[PDB]
Design a protein around this ligand. Structure first.
Ligand code: GNP
Ligand code: MG
Lengths: 166, 469, 166
């Protein structure tokens, strides 16, 4: 089996942890406990191949921006998350993409843009704007809901496929 | 570079040496070290390693007491800030504000990451190893007081969080699925008629499913504390490894029930139907990746009372003999095929816990607790990383839940199975073997005939699910 | 060459695992990882004859009592171990031997009785008691101290000789 190191980044509160735990335990976390640094392991078969996913859940709170570079060097793929009812989180995406590009010193890093919280009806970011940004980066855009599981497997597994073909 | 605090005011500033830390020959991997160095690395400012926190929190009790660990991390957290540099002093001395370039860098690249990491240890400690706090009231009071003394807005988010987590642990998990669970299947016994439940009256598909739910929950309830230190093998095992023992006892009980169902069915033709049904249950276990279930059947088929029933196995259809043989091959050559199979499936699954127990036990007694270097006695951390690697594998398979509906009455039926009755092990074991001799005497004694005991059709409904609801 | 399948049986906590480890492992290496292949095989020379020892040791799995028959049937020789400071483990020997005879369907199975010293606790089974029990069964008695590596090789080599002279 092949191992893949995925990293989930994005502004605080977008649902990086909820997406991760929904994928790992099929459970939705309603509590909001700010992450410092957490890692998860998951054995799964993707496109007929068995693989071991190592998922690093990062801190969104800017009061930990110093540790960032530390996890981007080891990561092979990145899930860049923002919430569709939070314009500032969407605007923070640009910064995460640039840090990753800088650290790993590459303009071809495997990543997926994820618009989380698609179960909520108070949308402030249109699918089209996120889609345009994704195209400008040459990556796919996947909308999800850690609450309903909608699009969750798709986001993580698409990221795995990008690392595999990269 | 960046000047660290004086080693005379902060113990975690002593430089690394062959006397206090050893690395393995791409973050550094610690082979051995003093408790002080282990804690420094546990909360290092340069790189991340969430793998280290779990390993440490899971195994530290053999080389460090809880109270002492708390003292050391609080001491780690209290980092003294550096004195103003020459440029700062010159500014202060002229009545203006210092740029404090170095102080700000030190807070950003050393203090903050170290303090956040200390807090991370505290959160995980309380979150997943609360028993330390349950067993020591003062330990909890000290943690609550430490967390409550932390000042500064650069920590308030995490302080508030941990305080709430601690209170939730003192006061006292829904599951969402992609698809919907398959419809419960019934055979001869109908819903609500628990009195007719038995091996051949319940649907084989539902027997395998309900037992898999049962066995999955037992597996998922085993905590690392029940494994570390090889406590399940010591005199206090019933106290220290209750969930592990509940799981093993269930497996044993089910294996004996299969053996009993077979040898107590004296009529050859009916016994063949019983063996055949059990192999079909095995087939469903394999489809569900319930390896524990698969092995309970294999152990039953390979027990002394059953293994010797040549006349019975001669009538089992060839396709089923192959199924049983493939299952048996998983255990051969020290489970080589099983290990390969487990690493290749798509969970959910229910692993065989036996393998893990043997590996933990050997790792624990095949490695020294400390490594000596220049007279110095260092904590052998590699031994701990190995035990934690095993407990980590176990936990990885404990995450995925099964998408199957529980059937209260069938579950109850299997929870109350008691093949041994009030008889002791030796007596029951001998009873089964004597029954085997009765139904299929040793050669050259002739094979006798026995009357049928079942009043309902013995034809199996098969193991292919039906799709109506 | 000839491969001998040897099974170590006995009550939990008598040091079965330490015996096997002492026989197989490399004694002059800092780390031991039983999670690696061939941690059960060992090529040795006994009385000028080179052979392969395959140790079937399931220490730590004693609670899986219904799996005993299957684990034992594959062995050619058996080490019946007890702890010299545990009278219970000594009294359990009788049934282990009976179970071995039943699974091997033979009244003459190659076996050795092993008294192991696990620690510094007080000895409760004297050598004479063990030698009398061993004599009553017609088998060799060997005392070991896995911790100090005394008598370990002797226990297994004596069993191999018992198999060869069968
Ligand atoms: N309705 C809804 N709420 C969600 C969703 N994902 C997360 N939330 C909620 O949003 C809050 C924050 O989620 P969380 O996973 O902690 O966010 P995070 O990005 O990990 N935060 P941090 O960076 O601080 O660690 C929680 O109350 C959570 O239940 C979603 O898809 N739908
Ligand atoms: Mg989080």
């Amino acid at each position: 089996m092949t191992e893949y190191k995925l990293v989930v980044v994005g502004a605080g509160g977008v649902g990086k942890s909820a997406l991760t735990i929904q994928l790992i335990q099929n459970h939705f976390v309603d509590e909001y406990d700010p992450t410092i640094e957490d890692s998860y392991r998951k054995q799964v078969v993707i496109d007929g191949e068995t693989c071991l996913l190592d998922i690093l859940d990062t801190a969104g709170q800017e009061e930990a921006s110093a540790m960032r570079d530390q996890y981007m060097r080891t990561g092979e793929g990145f899930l860049c998350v923002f919430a569709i009812n939070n314009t500032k989180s969407f605007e923070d995406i640009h910064q995460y993409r640039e840090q990753i590009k800088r650290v790993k010193d590459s303009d071809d890093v495997p990543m997926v843009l994820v618009g989380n919280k698609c179960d909520l009806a108070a949308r402030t970011v249109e699918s089209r704007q996120a889609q345009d940004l994704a195209r400008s980066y040459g990556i796919p855009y996947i909308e999800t809901s850690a609450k309903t599981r909608q699009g969750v497997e798709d986001a993580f597994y698409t990221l795995v496929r990008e690392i595999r073909q990269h | 570079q960046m000047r660290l605090p004086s080693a005379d005011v902060y113990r975690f500033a002593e430089p690394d040496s062959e006397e206090n830390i050893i690395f393995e020959e791409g973050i550094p991997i610690i082979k051995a070290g003093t408790v002080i160095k282990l804690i420094e690395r546990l909360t290092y400012h340069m790189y991340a390693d969430p793998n280290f926190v779990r390993t440490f929190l899971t195994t530290y009790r053999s080389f460090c007491k809880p109270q002492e660990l708390l003292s050391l991390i609080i001491e780690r957290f209290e980092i003294p800030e550096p004195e103003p540099t020459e440029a700062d002093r010159i500014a202060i001395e002229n009545g203006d504000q210092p740029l404090s370039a170095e102080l700000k860098r030190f807070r950003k690249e050393y203090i903050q990451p170290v303090q956040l990491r200390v807090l991370n240890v505290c959160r995980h400690w309380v979150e997943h190893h609360f028993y330390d706090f349950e067993r020591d009231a003062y330990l909890l009071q000290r943690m609550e007081e430490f967390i409550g003394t932390v000042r500064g807005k650069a920590m308030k988010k995490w302080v508030e969080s941990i305080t709430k987590i601690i209170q939730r642990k003192k006061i006292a998990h829904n599951i969402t699925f992609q698809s919907s669970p398959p419809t419960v299947e019934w055979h001869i016994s109908r819903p609500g008629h628990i009195e007719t439940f038995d091996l051949l009256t319940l649907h084989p598909i539902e027997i395998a499913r309900q037992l898999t739910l049962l066995e999955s929950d037992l597996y998922r309830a085993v905590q690392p504390s029940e494994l570390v230190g090889s406590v399940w093998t010591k005199e206090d095992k019933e106290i220290n490894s209750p969930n592990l023992l509940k799981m093993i006892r269930h497996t044993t009980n089910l294996t004996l029930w299969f053996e009993k169902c077979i040898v107590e069915t004296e009529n050859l033709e009916e016994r063949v139907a019983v063996v055949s049904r059990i192999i079909e249950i095995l087939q469903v276990f394999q489809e569900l990746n319930n390896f524990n279930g698969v092995l309970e059947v294999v152990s039953a088929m390979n027990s002394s009372p059953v293994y010797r029933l040549d006349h019975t196995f001669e009538q089992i259809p060839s396709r089923q003999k192959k199924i049983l043989e493939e299952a048996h091959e998983l255990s051969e050559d020290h489970y080589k095929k099983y290990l390969a199979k487990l690493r290749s499936i798509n969970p959910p699954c229910v692993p065989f816990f036996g393998i893990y127990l043997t590996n933990i036990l050997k790792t624990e007694e095949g490695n020294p607790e400390v490594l000596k270097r220049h007279g110095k006695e260092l904590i052998n951390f590699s031994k701990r990383r190995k035990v934690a690697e095993i407990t980590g594998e176990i936990q990885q398979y404990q995450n995925q839940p099964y998408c199957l509906r529980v059937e209260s009455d069938i579950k109850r039926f299997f929870e109350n199975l008691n093949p041994m009755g009030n008889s002791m092990e030796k007596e029951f074991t001998d009873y089964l073997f004597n029954k085997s001799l009765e139904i299929e005497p040793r050669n050259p004694k002739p094979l006798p005939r026995f009357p049928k005991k079942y009043s309902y059709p013995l034809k199996s409904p098969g193991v292919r699910p039906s799709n109506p609801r």
